[PDB]
Each structure stands twice: as structure tokens, then as C-alpha cells.
């Protein structure tokens, strides 16, 4: 209720391409966070949204001296510390694979080396929902083993409705069309 209403109020009032581009980005981020909350609820795991990598290391290995290592200050969405293995999690909502590939490449090359020097067994997990079909795709073998079914009940229609109204309001706007 209040989330939808707040976006609606903003789409009603917006007059300029630059402000409209920020509403569009905000809707896409709210849709991403919605999926993350529903995913963690369905799997009964702790819901987080952007944890600094140093803070993840400190939680799994409290006796670490951060200064001895070169820790990239990335903020993956969430993680699962099982006591023997660390699953780095990032949520995606997208009909395509490109954003998954980008994030997979970044976290693989930036997180795995320092986790290997520290000695923490780590897997990069990316969980994507298709907002149109509600189908879930998972990169991450240990995550699939731990969670062979994902009993989520997803409904992205309201996020599409809001963004479509925004795009209809600016369908004749050259500038906004380019800020695509
Ligand atoms: C889907 O996965 C991600 O792209 C992701 O989690 C991104 C972020 O956390 C950031 C915010 C964000 C932007 C767009 C979307 Cl749609 C979701 C979140 C945090 C601040 N600086 C980078 C982007
Ligand atoms: Cl405006
Ligand atoms: Cl103006
Ligand atoms: Cl990041
Ligand atoms: Mn994030
Ligand atoms: Mn994400």
C-alpha cells in the first residue's frame, strides 16, 4: 500500500525528464528489494540488503585483522554463513542475463581471492527473478543444494503498472527517451 501510493504521488507530480528518470530507477530498485524480502522469507534466512564485505568477514571470522588484507569494499546484497561455507548472495530482477553476468564477474574476481587468502570457503550466488514470468534462476551450486525448491509467491504487476504510467507520461519527451 504505502510504497505504491508514494510512487503514484511522485508520478502524478513529476514534470521533468531528470526527475522522472529517478522515479524509474527507484521503482526498479524497490522491485529488486521486494524480491529480496520475499526470497529470504521463503527460505527462512536473514534478510539483508547491501552488507559491506569487511562486515561480512568480521561476522564469519571475528578474530580477523582487516588491515592485513586488501578487502574490496563491495556491498553484496546478503550472505549466508553456514558455519563451514560462506554464500555471497545478490538478488536480481530482470528478464535477461546481462546484469547477472556483470555482477557474477565482479564478485568472482573481487571477493574470491581475498576470501581464499583469509581462508573462508566462499561461493558467489546470484538469484534472479524474471519479473514477467516469475521464474527463478540461480547461479551457485551450493545454494541450489541447500535450497532445492524456492516456495515464493511473487507479484510484480504493480511495479510494471507504476513504471508504465511514468513511461506513458513521457512518451513524447526526447530527453527522457534518451535517458532510457
Ligand atoms: C540487482 O543487483 C544490484 O544491481 C544491486 O544489488 C545494486 C545495489 O545494491 C545498488 C542500488 C540498486 C540499484 C538498482 C537496483 Cl535495480 C537495485 C539496487 C547500491 C548502490 N550502488 C550500486 C547499486
Ligand atoms: Cl519534476
Ligand atoms: Cl521545465
Ligand atoms: Cl558492490
Ligand atoms: Mn544491492
Ligand atoms: Mn542485487
Automatic annotation (TrEMBL):
It is found in: Host cell. Mn(2+) 1 binds at residues 32, 77, 90-91. Mn(2+) 2 binds at residues 50, 77. Mn(2+) 3 binds at residues 50, 77, 90. Mn(2+) 4 binds at residue 77. It comes from the Viruses. Belongs to the Bunyavirales RNA polymerase family. This is RNA-directed RNA polymerase L. It comes from Ebinur lake virus. The lineage of its organism: Viruses, Riboviria, Orthornavirae, Negarnaviricota, Polyploviricotina. The chain holds residues 3 to 182 of 2238 of the full protein.
